[PDB]
Structures are given as C-alpha cells and as structure tokens.
Design an enzyme around this catalytic site. Sequence first.
Site, PDB file in Angstrom:
ATOM      1  N   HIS A   1      35.141  41.953  32.877  1.00 54.01           N
ATOM      2  CA  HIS A   1      34.501  43.122  33.509  1.00 54.01           C
ATOM      3  C   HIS A   1      33.202  43.628  32.916  1.00 54.01           C
ATOM      4  O   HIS A   1      32.233  43.924  33.630  1.00 54.01           O
ATOM      5  CB  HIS A   1      35.453  44.301  33.542  1.00 54.01           C
TER       6      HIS A   1
ATOM      7  N   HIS B   1      40.409  40.062  28.962  1.00 57.39           N
ATOM      8  CA  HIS B   1      40.054  40.215  30.364  1.00 57.39           C
ATOM      9  C   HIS B   1      39.038  41.360  30.595  1.00 57.39           C
ATOM     10  O   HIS B   1      38.039  41.196  31.294  1.00 57.39           O
ATOM     11  CB  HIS B   1      41.307  40.458  31.203  1.00 57.39           C
TER      12      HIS B   1
ATOM     13  N   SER C   1      37.763  35.677  33.031  1.00 55.90           N
ATOM     14  CA  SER C   1      38.563  35.713  31.790  1.00 55.90           C
ATOM     15  C   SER C   1      39.672  34.667  31.737  1.00 55.90           C
ATOM     16  O   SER C   1      40.394  34.624  30.766  1.00 55.90           O
ATOM     17  CB  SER C   1      39.134  37.109  31.561  1.00 55.90           C
TER      18      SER C   1
ATOM     19  N   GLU D   1      37.520  41.721  41.298  1.00 58.87           N
ATOM     20  CA  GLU D   1      38.524  40.949  40.560  1.00 58.87           C
ATOM     21  C   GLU D   1      38.435  39.437  40.768  1.00 58.87           C
ATOM     22  O   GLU D   1      38.491  38.709  39.811  1.00 58.87           O
ATOM     23  CB  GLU D   1      39.958  41.453  40.796  1.00 58.87           C
TER      24      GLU D   1
HETATM   25  C1  LIG Z   1      42.217  47.682  40.511  1.00 65.37           C
HETATM   26  S1  LIG Z   1      43.037  48.323  41.808  1.00 65.37           S
HETATM   27  O1  LIG Z   1      43.624  49.519  41.263  1.00 65.37           O
HETATM   28  O2  LIG Z   1      42.123  48.619  42.862  1.00 65.37           O
HETATM   29  C2  LIG Z   1      44.163  47.357  42.381  1.00 65.37           C
HETATM   30  C3  LIG Z   1      43.921  46.591  43.514  1.00 65.37           C
HETATM   31  C4  LIG Z   1      44.940  45.774  44.017  1.00 65.37           C
HETATM   32  C5  LIG Z   1      46.199  45.772  43.414  1.00 65.37           C
HETATM   33  C6  LIG Z   1      46.450  46.563  42.280  1.00 65.37           C
HETATM   34  C7  LIG Z   1      47.744  46.601  41.529  1.00 65.37           C
HETATM   35  C8  LIG Z   1      48.319  47.818  41.186  1.00 65.37           C
HETATM   36  C9  LIG Z   1      49.498  47.859  40.444  1.00 65.37           C
HETATM   37 CL1  LIG Z   1      50.243  49.416  40.031  1.00 65.37          CL
HETATM   38  C10 LIG Z   1      50.136  46.712  40.010  1.00 65.37           C
HETATM   39  C11 LIG Z   1      49.595  45.486  40.303  1.00 65.37           C
HETATM   40  C12 LIG Z   1      48.417  45.366  41.047  1.00 65.37           C
HETATM   41  C13 LIG Z   1      47.888  43.997  41.326  1.00 65.37           C
HETATM   42  O3  LIG Z   1      47.766  43.419  40.039  1.00 65.37           O
HETATM   43  C14 LIG Z   1      46.519  43.238  39.534  1.00 65.37           C
HETATM   44  C15 LIG Z   1      46.389  42.350  38.525  1.00 65.37           C
HETATM   45  C16 LIG Z   1      45.123  42.143  37.993  1.00 65.37           C
HETATM   46  N1  LIG Z   1      44.955  41.193  37.015  1.00 65.37           N
HETATM   47  C17 LIG Z   1      46.078  40.705  36.229  1.00 65.37           C
HETATM   48  C18 LIG Z   1      45.624  39.932  35.016  1.00 65.37           C
HETATM   49  C19 LIG Z   1      44.504  38.925  35.264  1.00 65.37           C
HETATM   50  C20 LIG Z   1      43.370  39.695  35.901  1.00 65.37           C
HETATM   51  C21 LIG Z   1      43.673  40.501  37.132  1.00 65.37           C
HETATM   52  C22 LIG Z   1      44.892  37.626  36.024  1.00 65.37           C
HETATM   53  N2  LIG Z   1      44.467  36.570  35.094  1.00 65.37           N
HETATM   54  C23 LIG Z   1      43.481  37.055  34.151  1.00 65.37           C
HETATM   55  C24 LIG Z   1      43.322  36.314  32.876  1.00 65.37           C
HETATM   56  O4  LIG Z   1      44.072  35.387  32.586  1.00 65.37           O
HETATM   57  O5  LIG Z   1      42.376  36.714  32.045  1.00 65.37           O
HETATM   58  C25 LIG Z   1      44.013  38.456  33.914  1.00 65.37           C
HETATM   59  N3  LIG Z   1      44.069  42.741  38.549  1.00 65.37           N
HETATM   60  C26 LIG Z   1      44.230  43.597  39.559  1.00 65.37           C
HETATM   61  N4  LIG Z   1      43.205  44.243  40.081  1.00 65.37           N
HETATM   62  N5  LIG Z   1      45.451  43.870  40.046  1.00 65.37           N
HETATM   63  C27 LIG Z   1      48.758  43.108  42.213  1.00 65.37           C
HETATM   64  F1  LIG Z   1      48.961  43.739  43.351  1.00 65.37           F
HETATM   65  F2  LIG Z   1      49.905  42.829  41.633  1.00 65.37           F
HETATM   66  F3  LIG Z   1      48.122  41.950  42.432  1.00 65.37           F
HETATM   67  C28 LIG Z   1      45.422  47.355  41.772  1.00 65.37           C
HETATM   68 FE   LIG Z   2      40.550  43.537  35.883  1.00 69.59          FE
END
Ligand SMILES: CS(=O)(=O)c1cccc(-c2cc(Cl)ccc2[C@@H](Oc2cc(N3CCC4(CC3)CN[C@H](C(=O)O)C4)nc(N)n2)C(F)(F)F)c1
Ligand SMILES: [Fe+3]
Length: 271
Positions: free
Chosen positions: A154, A149, A213, A194
Amino acid sequence: TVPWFPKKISDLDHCNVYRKRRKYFADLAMNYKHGDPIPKVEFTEEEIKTWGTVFQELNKLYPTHACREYLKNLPLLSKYCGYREDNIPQLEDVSNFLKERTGFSIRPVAGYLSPRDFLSGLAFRVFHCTQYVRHSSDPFYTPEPDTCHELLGHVPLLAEPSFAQFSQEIGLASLGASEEAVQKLATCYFFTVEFGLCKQDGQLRVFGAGLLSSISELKHALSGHAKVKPFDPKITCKQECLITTFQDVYFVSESFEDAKEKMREFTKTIK
Ligand SMILES: CS(=O)(=O)c1cccc(-c2cc(Cl)ccc2[C@@H](Oc2cc(N3CCC4(CC3)CN[C@H](C(=O)O)C4)nc(N)n2)C(F)(F)F)c1
Ligand SMILES: [Fe+3]
C-alpha cells in the site's frame, strides 16, 4: 436514517510464541488514540528474516510487474523510511513520510475493521495498518493482512497524489451511505486498490496492494493464465471478493485518472 460516520480525523477513535506475540501487537493497536505517535516495535530476528525474504523476492519482480507510479516512489522509501532487507520499516516513520507527500497518515489496527469503518478512514486520508509480521512458514502468500503487505503493497502508492485522491474519494463516497452503497464501494476498492491491474504504454502492470505484497500472486497475475476484464464499476461491484485463494478474475484500469473518473460517474448513480 443515516448511520453514524466520522466528521473529523479524531472520530476514527470510535471505530503459543506466535499467539503471545500477536497479542502484543493487538494491544498496541487497541490502546492507540488519535494524536499518539504510533508505537515503535522491536521486531524479532525471525520476523526480520521473513521481511527480508519477502522484500528481496518482490524487488526482483517489481521492475517488470509494477506500475510506474509504484516504481517511482519505492526508492524514496528506501532513502527516508529504512526499507532494506535487514530492517522492517516503522509505521510512525512511514506515516510522517506520507503526511508530507500526500496528507495520508496511518493508524495501527489489530485486525479487520468493517468495510464501512475502513473506508471512513480513507475519507480523512487515514489508512489503517497492521503491525505484525506474517508467519514464517509461508512468506509467499498470506490470507490475512500483515505489516509486510501494508508497507510493500500500500504505502508506495499512497505516496502518489493521483492515487491518494482516488482512494480518498472512495472513502468520501462511503460516509453515511447505505449498506448496499458501502458494499459496492468496498468491492470497487477490492478490485482496484487491492487487486488492480492497469495498462501503461500498452503493457499490463500491477497496482493492487494484495498483488504487490504476494510473491506468488504477483507472478500469477501477469502470467497469462489469469482471467482479466475491464474495470467498469457497475459490473466490477458485483464480483465476489475471495480470501482463501488467488483471485478468479482481475480488473484492468486504464490509469488512476481514468479509474477516478469512472468512480465519479458511478457514485452519482448510487446517491
Ligand atoms: C478494505 S475494505 O474494507 O473496503 C474491504 C473490501 C472488501 C472486503 C473486505 C473484508 C472485510 C472483512 Cl471484515 C473481512 C474480510 C474482507 C475481505 O478480506 C480482505 C482481505 C485482504 N487481504 C488479505 C491479505 C492479503 C491482502 C489482501 C492477500 N495476500 C497478501 C499477501 O500475501 O501479502 C495479503 N484485503 C481486503 N481488502 N479484504 C474478504 F471479503 F474476505 F475478501 C474489506
Ligand atoms: Fe490491503
């Protein structure tokens, strides 16, 4: 009161088989300090196979699915950073490539940082990246970030100056901001960097790393079956960010320059 935030790049220091293997990667990230070369990894045969499947299938889709900026930089990474079906690129190599191109660099990370901490990295053109490979049972979609990913989703856009600027500005706006402002900025990031779509010469193309990805979500996003709204920060920032599944909606930006302009107008209002 304003929360702690990093003032220089080094301040980012202050932010059974498979499980054993994941611990190895997690320790590499936890022991890393700014200035260290990023540890190089000897990937297993199975890991390389998973990468090869992901890489081969995504490369069949990119020409018809990815934005022009993505496609421009993708060949540069095969030439200089070892992007091939039989070789997983190293984070140190990619970091050095990006430093030359746009001043972006990489830090290894064990799992999620808080949105505040992640965005703070972008303020210094630092992108926190995982180093492990997704489980071999589902190459097509994984709900957690892995190195495939980071590298295929990215990196090619971090190498584009306009996109690097856009990303940095989300980070810079976040530094010391309120909890609410960080949440809104994180959501804007989620629906651009994203999971973003853009319009180029009238066609819908993909710039979101999470789409670029995922073999399955990349196809879903341009299939015609997906809900699609204009990128508009004041509305987009209210949309829920989901992780278990494909997104229920994607946002369409006009260009990286336009999205940047819309975020500039928006961040004035949340100061
Ligand atoms: C970057 S940020 O810090 O600004 C941000 C923004 C929004 C939410 C979050 C965040 C923070 C935490 Cl501590 C935990 C989870 C999230 C978010 O999770 C993810 C997952 C995430 N993946 C997860 C994995 C894949 C890619 C994208 C999905 N399929 C792809 C593939 O198959 O290859 C890979 N990407 C982001 N930005 N946030 C959620 F809230 F759950 F959606 C972070
Ligand atoms: Fe990412």
